[PDB]
C-alpha cells in the first residue's frame, strides 16, 4: 500500500528488441551513452509519476474503458536529443491510433492530478541515456515493424545496478 512510480507503455517483440541491441552495439560505443537493457526497451505512452494504490486503481479503471483498434509500428527513424541527453528510436509519421491512445491516457492522468511536464507527446524508444556528446546517428535496421495488440501499466524500480520495470496490468487493443 506504499506509492509506486508508474507509467503506461507499449512493448516490443523479443526478436525486434534483439535486432535493436545488436544494431546499437554496432553503431554506438560505450562512451556514446548508457545503454538501456534489452528488456527495458519500450515506448512510453504516459508518465504518471508517484502514484498511490488508490489512485492507481482509479487510473486502471479509466484505462480499461479505452476502446481502440490495434495499430502497426514501423521504426524508420532514429535521432538524438542532446538537452534531454538521450539517443532514441522512433517513427517519422506515427499512426493516429498511437496518438489517440497516448492523448487519452495523458488526459486521464492529468484529470487525476498527475504531474504535468506540459511537454508535447513525442513517441520514442530510448536507446541510450546520459548521452552528452553528439554522435552520428545511423538509420535504423531494416523492417523493424510489428502489430501493437495491447498496452501495459508498469512500475519502475532499481535493483542491483539495474532499472527494473514490473508489469502490473495489460489491456488489449481491439482488432
Ligand atoms: Cl530526414
Author numbering: 2 to 176
Task: Please share text taken word for word from the publication where this structure appeared.
The 2H phosphoesterase superfamily is an ancient group of proteins and protein domains characterized by a common fold and a few conserved active site residues. E. coli LigT is a 20-kDa protein that exhibits 2′,3′-cyclic nucleotide 3′-phosphodiesterase and 2′-5′-ligase/phosphodiesterase activities, but the biological function of the enzyme is unknown. The LigT structure presents a typical 2H phosphoesterase fold, in which the catalytic residues reside at the beginning of strands β2 and β6. As in other 2H family members, the active site has 2-fold symmetry; this symmetry also includes the 4 water molecules at the bottom of the active site, connecting the active-site β strands through water-mediated hydrogen bonds.
Hence, as opposed to CNPase, in which the active site is to a large extent pre-organized for substrate binding, LigT shows more flexibility.
